[PDB]
């Protein structure tokens, strides 16, 4: 990454998804990382939005392509698109082996 | 069908097992999903023992 510059610095699922969304919509996009590194939440006392959901409302970004969990508290301030990957709570145990 | 009765005014809302596809999202508004699913396998109960 210290030899590249721009979107090519990063790579991953949402990185490849950012291109596919831009291709099927036609717009030049610039991948930027969220300031605070957090997801979408609202403070208890200040009640200010933080993270990616905050940058959308306060006009600091244009769109969010990330593992953003579709919750009702966020659907009120921003618009969630249709889901692109269904998931749910599962169990992580100790695989073999064990060999016990 | 049901999507027809929505577009053509003969209904107000569709609460039914309606698959969310692109061709339907262009003519009617889908709400957020209430039940995720997918294609799976149905095998007969393994006839153990025998």
């Amino acid at each position: 990454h210290e030899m590249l510059e721009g979107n090519e610095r990063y790579e991953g699922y949402c990185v490849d998804l950012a291109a596919e969304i831009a291709k099927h919509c036609g717009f030049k996009y610039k991948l930027t990382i969220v300031g605070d590194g957090k997801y979408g939440a609202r403070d208890a006392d200040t009640k200010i939005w933080n993270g990616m959901v905050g940058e959308l409302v306060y006009g600091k970004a244009d769109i969010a392509i990330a593992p953003l969990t579709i919750t009702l508290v966020r659907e009120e301030v921003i618009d969630f698109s249709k889901p692109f990957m269904s998931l749910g709570i599962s169990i992580m145990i100790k695989k073999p082996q064990k060999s016990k | 069908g049901m999507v027809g009765e929505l577009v053509y005014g003969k209904a107000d809302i569709a609460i039914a097992p309606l698959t969310i596809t692109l061709v339907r999202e262009e003519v009617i508004d889908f709400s957020k999903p209430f039940m995720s699913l997918g294609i799976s396998i149905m095998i007969k109960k393994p006839q153990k023992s025998k």
Binding site: I65, I89, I93 | -
Partner: protein, 186 residues
């Protein structure tokens, strides 16, 4: 060794916990379902604290327990760690609740409606099912199932044979006790 999720809440040898704050912990709190309510009541008063500070701690706690601790989390992160070295984690059973990620736009934005349609065209063209299959299984560090066919483990242990030595010396301990009660009668 564990199939479904209701099974792991029926025992206490393998303690289980979630993250100390997040969408996972709050689910068990406000769960009106029978099985999930019993799970929260156990973790709410489990000592030592089954809750972990960060999600990275939850995975390290399953790998160090020799199979005596299980961490509950998203099916994405669990299926992902399963395809990472040392290939010691494994998703089991179905998912607890139904949730999903989504692309977010500001309300009343020009991007809102077109992007939403764009996700469906990718999902139906198999693009989303292919990128998913790309960044967790294709670029993964473990088989699965490709490891069940390349089983190159033909070892032999001493711990298995130790039981026949126990019943032998235990039989010799009963033999010497019978030996001592046979030299006295005659």
């Amino acid at each position: 060794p564990i199939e479904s999720a209701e099974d792991l809440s029926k025992q206490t040898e393998i303690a289980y916990g979630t993250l100390d704050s997040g969408s996972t912990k709050e689910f068990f709190r406000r769960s009106k379902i029978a099985v999930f309510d019993k799970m929260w009541t156990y973790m709410r008063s489990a000592e030592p604290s089954v809750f972990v500070r960060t999600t990275a701690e939850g995975v390290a706690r399953v790998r160090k327990s020799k199979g005596k601790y299980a961490y509950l989390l998203e099916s994405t992160m669990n299926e992902y760690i399963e395809q990472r070295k040392p290939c010691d984690t494994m998703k089991v059973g179905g998912n607890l609740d139904s949730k999903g990620y989504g692309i977010a736009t500001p309300k009343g934005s020009s991007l809102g409606t077109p992007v939403n349609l764009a996700v469906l065209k990718l999902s139906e063209q198999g693009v989303l099912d292919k990128l998913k299959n790309k960044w967790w299984y294709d670029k993964g560090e473990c088989g699965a199932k490709d490891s069940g066919s390349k089983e190159k483990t033909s070892a032999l242990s001493l711990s298995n044979v130790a039981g026949v030595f126990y019943i032998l010396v235990g039989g010799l301990g009963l033999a010497m006790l019978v030996a001592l009660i046979e030299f006295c009668y005659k």
